[PDB]
């Protein structure tokens, strides 16, 4: 309950992914969205989104590559050494 849920890709293009999720039970100040090639060397790329939003577009991706997308809810719990609140999915962008 105190973690984001139903993380899924709603729309996919060779270079982009529109993701959506359902907010956790507690209020979220902002989300950190991290993404990167699954199992690869490259450091993950990340951006923040205000807490009100439940959708995000990830652009600048490579066709037919598998990516690990993590959405972290940042609420009061996460301050002062509190635990991370993540949810992860894997998705292969189309070759189209």
């Amino acid at each position: 309950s105190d973690v984001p849920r139903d993380l899924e890709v709603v729309a996919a293009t060779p270079t982009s992914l529109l993701i959506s999720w359902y907010h956790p039970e507690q209020y979220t100040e902002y989300y950190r969205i991290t993404y990167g090639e699954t199992g690869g060397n490259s450091p993950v790329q990340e951006f923040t989104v205000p807490g009100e939003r439940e959708t995000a577009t990830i652009s600048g991706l490579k066709p037919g590559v598998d990516y690990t997308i993590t959405v972290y809810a940042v609420g009061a719990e996460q301050y002062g050494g509190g635990p991370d609140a993540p949810i992860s999915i894997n998705y292969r962008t189309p070759h189209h």
């Binding site: 100040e29 940042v74 002062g80």
Partner: protein, 380 residues
Amino acid sequence: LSPKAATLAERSAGLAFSLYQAMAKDQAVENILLSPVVVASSLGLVSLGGKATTASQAKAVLSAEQLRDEEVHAGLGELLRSLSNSTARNVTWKLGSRLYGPSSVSFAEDFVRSSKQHYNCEHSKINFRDKRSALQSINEWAAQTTDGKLPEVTKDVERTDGALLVNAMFFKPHWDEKFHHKMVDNRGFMVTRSYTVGVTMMHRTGLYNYYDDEKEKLQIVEMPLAHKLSSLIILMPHHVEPLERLEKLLTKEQLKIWMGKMQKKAVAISLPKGVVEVTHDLQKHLAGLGLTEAIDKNKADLSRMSGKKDLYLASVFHATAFEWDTEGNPFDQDIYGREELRSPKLFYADHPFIFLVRDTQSGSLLFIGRLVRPKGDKMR
């Protein structure tokens, strides 16, 4: 501020730091909360209702020797009016000042008239016979002045025969960028590394002027208040420790140095949420800085205040309810969708810290204090 009020703003800040340092040396003193202008207006009232060395020592404690008596009362009167400039008057800033004299003492009309104009001073008689009723009159007056935020000044009065000056305040900093009302939870406050109390804390990540002094082991953050008309600066050591070491570094020269090295960075701020109630009797500390005549039962000359030498300064109560709350001005939430907040600095105020509130327009210091021991019953 006018040139005379500007010099007295500098002198009032200088006095508050000397008073803070004298109080920090006392082992019985835990939290400190001083409004430099209210402290200075207390000395101004002693000068207004005092004669010869009783009044000259009041100006000496303020380091205002080369200032005429009219320049002192007019400058301090203008400074008290300027306190409502960065805040919502009688909403986020409430102040009352009352002089309590014994039932057998009548205040001179000349003093009542001038003290009310210069210092908004109220005058009252107090029956020291029943101590329970004399305390209830002072406590009910402070409670009404602050609408219950400061429900009690003191539980006992020591000197029960002279004049009692009581200053009751409520101050609530209204942030330029509010904390969200739901970004609050229960946390631990380390009073020492072996004693932790429970406190409610409020949390937010934003852009703030910040400096981490690695050599002196402390973080310093500036939190602007409404429309940047004032700002609240917090100085907190890296480790939970007594504030004695950091207090030695508390000079205008070092504060100017720390202010110059601050850079606007993303900071994850967590602060205790709630009302901090602090009462000080400044009588013994002001005497220790040069106010020996006014506080002495025999040498005190308060003839301008009552008409006869039948009054001495028994107490100078400085009581404040300083409320840390989430409320402030709204801001664009799209600042959260910006790269700058990627790896914020962590300013987690879960151990003793020094804080100061400064008026940005006049440069005048509004509050100086420290939070060592949060009440212990204000948690949700």
